[PDB]
Design an enzyme around this catalytic site. Structure first.
Site, mmCIF file in Angstrom:
data_model
loop_
_atom_site.group_PDB
_atom_site.id
_atom_site.type_symbol
_atom_site.label_atom_id
_atom_site.label_comp_id
_atom_site.label_asym_id
_atom_site.label_seq_id
_atom_site.Cartn_x
_atom_site.Cartn_y
_atom_site.Cartn_z
ATOM 1 N N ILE A 226 -1.114 9.092 27.213
ATOM 2 C CA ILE A 226 -1.142 7.827 27.967
ATOM 3 C C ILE A 226 -1.665 8.101 29.377
ATOM 4 C CG2 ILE A 226 0.309 6.061 29.099
ATOM 5 C CD1 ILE A 226 2.030 6.048 26.558
ATOM 6 N N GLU B 200 4.035 9.766 20.203
ATOM 7 C CA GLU B 200 4.711 10.832 19.438
ATOM 8 C C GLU B 200 4.958 10.344 18.005
ATOM 9 O OE1 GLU B 200 4.522 13.656 20.542
ATOM 10 O OE2 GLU B 200 5.118 13.914 22.644
ATOM 11 N N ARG C 182 1.826 10.724 16.123
ATOM 12 C CA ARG C 182 1.568 12.123 15.760
ATOM 13 C C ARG C 182 2.398 12.675 14.608
ATOM 14 N NH1 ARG C 182 2.009 12.985 21.995
ATOM 15 N NH2 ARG C 182 -0.179 13.130 22.641
#
Ligand SMILES: *[C@@H]1O[C@H](CO)[C@@H](O)[C@H](O)[C@H]1NC(C)=O
Length: 246
Positions: A71, A160, A163
């Site tokens: 970000i 996250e 991911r």
């Protein structure tokens, strides 16, 4: 662009958002069936815009670097905010240029610096869909100490989760009740670069990591990941940071 609305949100709509976010990241190649993020992208195409709406329908737009899912900054009404680091300053050349004013946050975007600014580690900050709603609300009006904690929530519940399927699931479990991240969640966040690098090095090494990766499992036990047959590689990680960026 991708969007997520907290009003009426549930595990299904959150999963659709994390799907959209993964799918918005460009790749030309899979390694062990996991999309490989690009070495680099020139100009404005480097940044994905995430439109997030709190329960009341107020919104911020978050700029995400598509090479690493980092970000960079966000826009809240007529004000843009960027981390205090060279990559975010660069992003500020491309996104939210129509903002009436630009505030550089008094920290970079890395977990270490954010936790210092928030006054607490990730281990102590509840996450979940309610916490994300709060985080969006916090970011609407400038408060750098409050914002750091809001950004720790935002990064974990968006990037996250994109991911790692395990992190996505962890947030789905926290759809109506926040809870601090599991130690497994923290371990995965901290290991993403290392995992990404070892999965790439395994090509050319018969599926075997050049250097093992240590993770915490769901039971709170420390484990060694040594090759691509591990559940972490076959059924968890969803995006690979390119070794050119490691
Ligand atoms: C590969 O990984 C699995 C764990 O999923 C382990 O059981 C196996 O012993 C490892 N083999 C090698 C050659 O590293």
């Amino acid at each position: 662009d991708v969007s997520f609305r907290l009003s009426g949100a549930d595990p299904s709509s959150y999963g659709m958002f994390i799907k959209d976010l993964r799918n918005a990241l460009p790749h030309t190649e899979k390694v062990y069936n996991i999309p490989l993020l690009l070495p680099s992208v020139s100009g404005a195409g480097r940044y994905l815009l995430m439109h997030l709406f709190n329960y009341d329908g107020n919104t911020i737009t978050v700029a995400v670097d598509v090479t690493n899912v980092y970000i960079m900054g966000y826009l809240a009404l007529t004000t843009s905010y960027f981390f205090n680091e060279p990559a975010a300053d660069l992003a500020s050349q491309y996104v939210f240029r129509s903002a009436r004013r630009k505030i550089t946050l008094p920290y970079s975007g890395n977990y270490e610096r954010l936790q210092i600014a928030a006054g607490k580690p990730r281990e102590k900050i509840p996450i979940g869909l309610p916490a994300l709603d709060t985080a969006i609300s916090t970011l609407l009006h400038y408060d750098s100490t409050a914002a750091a904690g809001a950004l720790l929530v935002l990064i974990q519940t968006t990037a996250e989760a994109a991911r790692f399927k395990y992190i996505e699931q962890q947030i789905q479990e926290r759809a109506y009740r926040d809870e601090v991240p599991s130690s497994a969640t923290i371990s995965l966040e901290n290991s993403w670069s290392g995992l990404s690098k070892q999965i790439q090095l395994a090509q050319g090494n018969n599926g075997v990591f050049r250097t093992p990766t240590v993770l915490v499992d769901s039971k709170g036990n420390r484990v060694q990941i040594t090759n691509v047959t591990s559940n972490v590689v076959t059924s968890n990680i969803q995006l690979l940071l390119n070794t050119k960026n490691i």
